[PDB]
Amino acid sequence: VVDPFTRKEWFDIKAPSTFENRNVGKTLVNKSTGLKSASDALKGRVVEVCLADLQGSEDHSFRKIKLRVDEVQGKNLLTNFHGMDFTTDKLRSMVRKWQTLIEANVTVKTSDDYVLRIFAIAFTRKQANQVKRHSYAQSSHIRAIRKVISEILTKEVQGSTLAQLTSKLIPEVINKEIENATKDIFPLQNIHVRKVKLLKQPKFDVGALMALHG
Amino acid sequence: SQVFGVARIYASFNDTFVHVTDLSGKETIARVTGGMKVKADRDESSPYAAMLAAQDVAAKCKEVGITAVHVKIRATGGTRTKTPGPGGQAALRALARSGLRIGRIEDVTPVPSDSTRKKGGRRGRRL
Amino acid sequence: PKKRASNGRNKKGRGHVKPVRCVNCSKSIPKDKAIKRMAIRNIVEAAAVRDLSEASVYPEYALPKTYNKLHYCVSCAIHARIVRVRSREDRKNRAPP
Amino acid sequence: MRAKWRKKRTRRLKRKRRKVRARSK
Amino acid sequence: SINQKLALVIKSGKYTLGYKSTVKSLRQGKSKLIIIAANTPVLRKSELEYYAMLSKTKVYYFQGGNNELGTAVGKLFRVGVVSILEAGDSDILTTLA
Amino acid sequence: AKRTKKVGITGKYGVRYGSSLRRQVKKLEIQQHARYDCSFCGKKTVKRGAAGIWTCSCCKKTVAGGAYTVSTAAAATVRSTIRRLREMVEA
Amino acid sequence: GRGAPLAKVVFRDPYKYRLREEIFIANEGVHTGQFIYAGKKASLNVGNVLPLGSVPEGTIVSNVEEKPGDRGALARASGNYVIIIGHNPDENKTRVRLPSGAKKVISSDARGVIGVIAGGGRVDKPLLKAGRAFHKYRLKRNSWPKTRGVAMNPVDHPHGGGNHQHIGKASTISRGAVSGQKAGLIAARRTGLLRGSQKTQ
RNA sequence: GGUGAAAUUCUUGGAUUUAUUGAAGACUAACUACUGCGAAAGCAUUUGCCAAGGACGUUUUCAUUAAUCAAGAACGAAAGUUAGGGGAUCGAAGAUGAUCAGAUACCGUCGUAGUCUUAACCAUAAACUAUGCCGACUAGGGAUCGGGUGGUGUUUUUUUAAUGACCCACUCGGCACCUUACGAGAAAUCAAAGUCUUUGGGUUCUGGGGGGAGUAUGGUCGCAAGGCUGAAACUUAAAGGAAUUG
Ligand SMILES: [Mg+2]
Ligand SMILES: [Mg+2]
Ligand SMILES: [Mg+2]
Ligand SMILES: [Mg+2]
Ligand SMILES: [Mg+2]
Ligand SMILES: [Mg+2]
Ligand SMILES: [Mg+2]
Ligand SMILES: [Mg+2]
Ligand SMILES: [Mg+2]
Ligand SMILES: [Mg+2]
Ligand SMILES: [Mg+2]
Ligand SMILES: [Mg+2]
Ligand SMILES: [Mg+2]
Ligand SMILES: [Mg+2]
Ligand SMILES: [Mg+2]
Ligand SMILES: [Mg+2]
Ligand SMILES: [Mg+2]
Ligand SMILES: [Mg+2]
Ligand SMILES: [Mg+2]
Ligand SMILES: [Mg+2]
Ligand SMILES: [Mg+2]
Ligand SMILES: [Mg+2]
Ligand SMILES: [Mg+2]
Ligand SMILES: [Mg+2]
Ligand SMILES: [Zn+2]
Ligand SMILES: [Zn+2]
Known part of the structure; x- marks a missing residue:
């Protein structure tokens, strides 16, 4: 004698700025009654959409994104960065036998003071003419690849918030400066950022947040 | 084109779950389990069941609003079997075959940088 | 007596590896003695692939298989998986197929 | 009987004759 | 390292150990660099420092106790301060210090 | 000339109270009676005098510490954890 | 003290x-x-x-x-x-x-x-003898030594008397007991050797 | 939920599923291999620090300083013990749900100690290659790990190089595998288990039919549990190994 759907207030999800479709999807709440309202209650949920489902082209089939809801207005709720994950399949595929895996991470701030820890993975590659059947690095190789990745990733951040960092990551500029520095040490294939998580946001700043909008 | 949500099909042995939610997760929409749609414990996970539950589940999905939905299929995981149950397939199968849309579906099985000792002790389950 | 130079399986110059847990019965078993299978397989399956792209958005989509490494305990590897048991000679052949 | 179980057999058996001899110390 | 430079100073130069005399050093402007131990109390410190700036002597706060500074200079007792008068082959006066 | 096989300072209790207890008391007597390194002037001359109070022969500094030892394990970690959290406030 | x-x-x-x-x-x-x-x-x-x-x-x-x-x-x-x-x-x-x-x-x-x-750590150390207890309470209050109520006559205590020494009735006393009754394990919601780890959750 | 099937159990306390975040302790998945290192036990996230090591290179240095070892000593998986801490997980004991003729078990649940760590004990494992160490010699092949050498080799573009990773030949020293077998073995098999009645390079240690029995005893070490050392009476015609056909 209820059926919450005869009572669910409804809603649609809007995305930020540095992508393609600002429109994402729909949601449900509960009519903003006196004592417990649809506003302040939830909103502050999160949503994971593959950015190939967000940027259009599938050269992006992996690479998932975490968007969070901060502010809301009349059947319209905006969203801002909250993370970026890979996919299980790609990773589980990238990790082949017969080759060295190399991972490394760092914790670092931005201008607009969000704190994050981004990750990075690479794999030693066979060189085209290789006779031996595996290709492994010399540890000393691996420590030096990590140190560069590290030297690189710490530079890439503290540039104009995730804002720019977001704009930085999407076309994977980082990926190739890695590839750049690296090739002086060792072959290496794939080479991605793979993960980045958020752990200490600044303060709301209704002004600044509203900058990705229009 | 559609209105979107998330599928999330947990298929272990002994039972298979299906339940669509708001693409944010916080808000449900219709569940129903393999156990629900037949009665004999032993059969609580069979594809023949997971179908009839994915039947009920699709119905409420298109009866409330969701026109489409991405799936995140999943085994027990942790320190357990890690491999998909029987009724993951049938469910998926019989829920796209219900006239709902499919789009970009990954496997969200939890997998650990191993440990917390598995159960059943160093000598295995001997029976 | 002896009926394997590799003794159990695969450890020359180590003295101690480290035990994994059998995917089937959970028996502990040294990693090098383990017996392993890469269970790479489609997320969908046999029949579903048509009714996949049929009731979907996107063109043909992409499709992303599931990959996981399987470890058996001999007894479990024998009871079902890779084993049979082989003649005194067939034994020595390590070639997969 | 299993060797390990007979090794325990006599292991006990000693711990008992150990006992009875102390009554006499 | 700094101790390595220090023990070079010791075996080719002229120094003096401990409070009263590295004050005589400071008054006569004979001191080229005084070295103050971690734990020596902040009066002794502040005062030496005062004396120091009055003769313009650069001061090196030795991260380490009077017990080690004694070892630093190869003596089996403890020293709270060392004073440099002649720097041997060592470059202490004109390195990072 | 090794005087006793294993009782050490715990000799005084002769035979009474039983090994176990004597063993325990020995451990902490040795703890509580011993001379310690002075954090300030740096001569091993902190001797005890009533639980918790550790003072220095010369230089005369007196520090609150453990009941039978200068620094209790807990209070030390507490030291270093206070290090950590304070770090969080200038950084 | x-x-x-x-x-x-x-x-x-x-x-x-x-x-x-x-x-x-x-x-x-x-x-x-x-x-x-x-x-x-x-x-x-x-x-x-x-x-x-x-x-x-x-x-x-x-x-x-x-x-x-x-x-x-x-x-x-x-x-x-x-x-x-x-x-x-x-x-x-x-x-x-x-x-x-x-x-x-x-x-x-x-x-x-x-x-x-x-x-x-002060309590890690065995008192060892009665005297050190004695000298301890000498500067606290007059609580030591302690006559077992079970060694008293009945005038003296709920536990007193009997031709052998015994508490003779449940020694877990009610919260709602009355003065002169509360001697034993007051309000005890369990009793017996605490087995297993403790530590609040 | 769990199983072969179940039941104990959990569920207006919205269980199980979902979502966001948080805490605890353990662990180090995939990459992981007939790959590495260490005297053995053993050792797999990063990064700093601390000292250590082999192999290699060497027209450096000392110059017999060495080989092996009763006694004695360092270390020594798991469990176990002492005193703290920790106590997520899994879990001897215990209790239960089932199964069973029974079922003190196997299977399911609750779960103590334990599992982790500090200080200290204990000194044992199929602690296994069931194969002592140093030296010599005797026979083929392709991989590989480390080091070094050689090349008007490849790939990296810039302006050629320099590098780096690769390729090819060689050579020390590793972890193994291949095929042979002059040879050895009771055989299985073995580049040593070969160079042994054609019996000698140097040295350590252990065994002498089976059971009695690693029992008794003494000594000794240990908090203990127990470790080391360790008999005899009596009994007995086989125990045992490897291969063969059933
Ligand atoms: Mg056999
Ligand atoms: Mg046989
Ligand atoms: Mg071993
Ligand atoms: Mg008696
Ligand atoms: Mg009194
Ligand atoms: Mg009394
Ligand atoms: Mg009393
Ligand atoms: Mg009386
Ligand atoms: Mg009464
Ligand atoms: Mg009375
Ligand atoms: Mg009475
Ligand atoms: Mg009594
Ligand atoms: Mg890892
Ligand atoms: Mg002797
Ligand atoms: Mg010896
Ligand atoms: Mg526990
Ligand atoms: Mg039981
Ligand atoms: Mg029963
Ligand atoms: Mg029992
Ligand atoms: Mg032995
Ligand atoms: Mg073995
Ligand atoms: Mg050869
Ligand atoms: Mg070269
Ligand atoms: Mg006969
Ligand atoms: Zn198994
Ligand atoms: Zn002092």
């Missing part, structure tokens, strides 16, 4: 030219001649007194106030402390876990002094 040493700490008097002295329970590692800082805007060092509001969770303090300015009530015995385990800034509260294991939530203005109380 005190496990832990005291620290005599002297202050200037804000309002009159003169020294005014306080009696602090010494936290471990504070020492003679050390400068002690007390106040809202004061730094996070061992020995200072700070209002639980201003210290990050995980802080470890002593002699903490139940209500602001009660001049210090919680954890004072040689070896104890309390741990801030989070704050709720609106209605400035601050949740702590006391020595007992209990969590309790008090005003953020409640002061506490950073550290643990000195003299820890």
Whole structure:
């Protein structure tokens, strides 16, 4: 004698700025009654959409994104960065036998003071003419690849918030400066950022947040 | 084109779950389990069941609003079997075959940088 | 007596590896003695692939298989998986197929 | 009987004759 | 390292150990660099420092106790301060210090 | 000339109270009676005098510490954890 | 009669030219001649007194106030402390876990002094003989030694009498018992050898 | 939920599923291999620090300083013990749900100690290659790990190089595998288990039919549990190994 759907207030999800479709999807709440309202209650949920489902082209089939809801207005709720994950399949595929895996991470701030820890993975590659059947690095190789990745990733951040960092990551500029520095040490294939998580946001700043909008 | 949500099909042995939610997760929409749609414990996970539950589940999905939905299929995981149950397939199968849309579906099985000792002790389950 | 130079399986110059847990019965078993299978397989399956792209958005989509490494305990590897048991000679052949 | 179980057999058996001899110390 | 430079100073130069005399050093402007131990109390410190700036002597706060500074200079007792008068082959006066 | 096989300072209790207890008391007597390194002037001359109070022969500094030892394990970690959290406030 | 040493700490008097002295329970590692800082805007060092509001969770303090300015009530015995385990800034509260294991939530203005109380471990040491007990209570109160109520005549105690010594009835007494009845295990909601780990969840 | 099937159990306390965040302790998945290192036990996230090592290179240095070892000593998986801490997980004991003729078990649940760590004990494992160490010699092949050498080799573009990773030949020293077998073995098999009635390079240690029995005893070490050392009476015609056909 209820059926919450005869009572669910409804809603649609809007995305930020540095992508393609600002429109994402729909949601449900509960009519903003006196004592417990649809506003302040939830909103502050999160949503994971593959950015190939967000940027259009599938050269992006992996690479998932975490968007969070901060502010809301009349059947319209905006969203801002909250993370970026890979996919299980790609990773589980990238990790082949017969080759060295190399991972490394760092914790670092931005201008607009969000704190994050981004990750990075690479794999030693066979060189085209290789006779031996595996290709492994010399540890000393691996420590030096990590140190560069590290030297690189710490530079890439503290540039104009995730804002720019977001704009930085999407076309994977980082990926190739890695590839750049690296090739002086060792072959290496794939080479991605793979993960980045958020752990200490600044303060709301209704002004600044509203900058990705229009 | 559609209105979107998330599928999330947990298929272990002994039972298979299906339940669509708001693409944010916080808000449900219709569940129903393999156990629900037949009665004999032993059969609580069979594809023949997971179908009839994915039947009920699709119905409420298109009866409330969701026109489409991405799936995140999943085994027990942790320190357990890690491999998909029987009724993951049938469910998926019989829920796209219900006239709902499919789009970009990954496997969200939890997998650990191993440990917390598995159960059943160093000598295995001997029976 | 002896009926394997590799003794159990695969450890020359180590003295101690480290035990994994059998995917089937959970028996502990040294990693090098383990017996392993890469269970790479489609997320969908046999029949579903048509009714996949049929009731979907996107063109043909992409499709992303599931990959996981399987470890058996001999007894479990024998009871079902890779084993049979082989003649005194067939034994020595390590070639997969 | 299993060797390990007979090794325990006599292991006990000693711990008992150990006992009875102390009554006499 | 700094101790390595220090023990070079010791075996080719002229120094003096401990409070009263590295004050005589400071008054006569004979001191080229005084070295103050971690734990020596902040009066002794502040005062030496005062004396120091009055003769313009650069001061090196030795991260380490009077017990080690004694070892630093190869003596089996403890020293709270060392004073440099002649720097041997060592470059202490004109390195990072 | 090794005087006793294993009782050490715990000799005084002769035979009474039983090994176990004597063993325990020995451990902490040795703890509580011993001379310690002075954090300030740096001569091993902190001797005890009533639980918790550790003072220095010369230089005369007196520090609150453990009941039978200068620094209790807990209070030390507490030291270093206070290090950590304070770090969080200038950084 | 005190496990832990005291620290005599002297202050200037804000309002009159003169020294005014306080009696602090010494936290471990504070020492003679050390400068002690007390106040809202004061730094996070061992020995200072700070209002639980201003210290990050995980802080470890002593002699903490139940209500602001009660001049210090919680954890004072040689070896104890309390741990801030989070704050709720609106209605400035601050949740702590006391020595007992209990969590309790008090005003953020409640002061506490950073550290643990000195003299820890005092109870690890066997008294050994009756005398050391004796000399212990000699400076506490007249509670020692203790005649077993079961060795008294019945005039004397619920346990008294019998032709053998025995409690003769359940020794777990009701909370609602009446004076002259409550001797035994008052209000005991279990009894027997505590097996298994303890430690509040 | 769990199983072969179940039941104990959990569920207006919205279980199980979902979502966001938080805490605890353990662990180090995939990459992981007939790959590495260490005297053995053993060792797999990063990064700093601390000292250590082999192999290699060497027209450096000392110059017999060495090989092996009763006594004695360092270390020594798991469990177990002492005193703290920790106590997520899994879990001897215990209790239960089932199964069973029974079922003190196998299977399911609750779960103590334990599992982790500090200080200290204990000194044992199929602690296994069931194969002592140093030296010599005797026979083919392709991989590989480390080091070095050689090349008008490849790939990296810039302006050629320099590098780096690769390729090819060689050579020390590793972890193994291949095929042979002059040879050895009771055989299985073995580049040593070969160079042994054609019996000798140097040295350590252990065994002498089976059971009695690693029992008794003494000594000794240990908090203990127990470790080391360790008999005899009596009994007995086989125990045992490897291969063969059933
Ligand atoms: Mg056999
Ligand atoms: Mg046989
Ligand atoms: Mg071993
Ligand atoms: Mg008697
Ligand atoms: Mg009295
Ligand atoms: Mg009494
Ligand atoms: Mg009494
Ligand atoms: Mg009487
Ligand atoms: Mg009564
Ligand atoms: Mg009475
Ligand atoms: Mg009575
Ligand atoms: Mg009695
Ligand atoms: Mg890893
Ligand atoms: Mg002797
Ligand atoms: Mg010996
Ligand atoms: Mg436990
Ligand atoms: Mg039982
Ligand atoms: Mg029963
Ligand atoms: Mg039993
Ligand atoms: Mg042995
Ligand atoms: Mg073996
Ligand atoms: Mg050869
Ligand atoms: Mg070359
Ligand atoms: Mg006969
Ligand atoms: Zn198994
Ligand atoms: Zn002193």
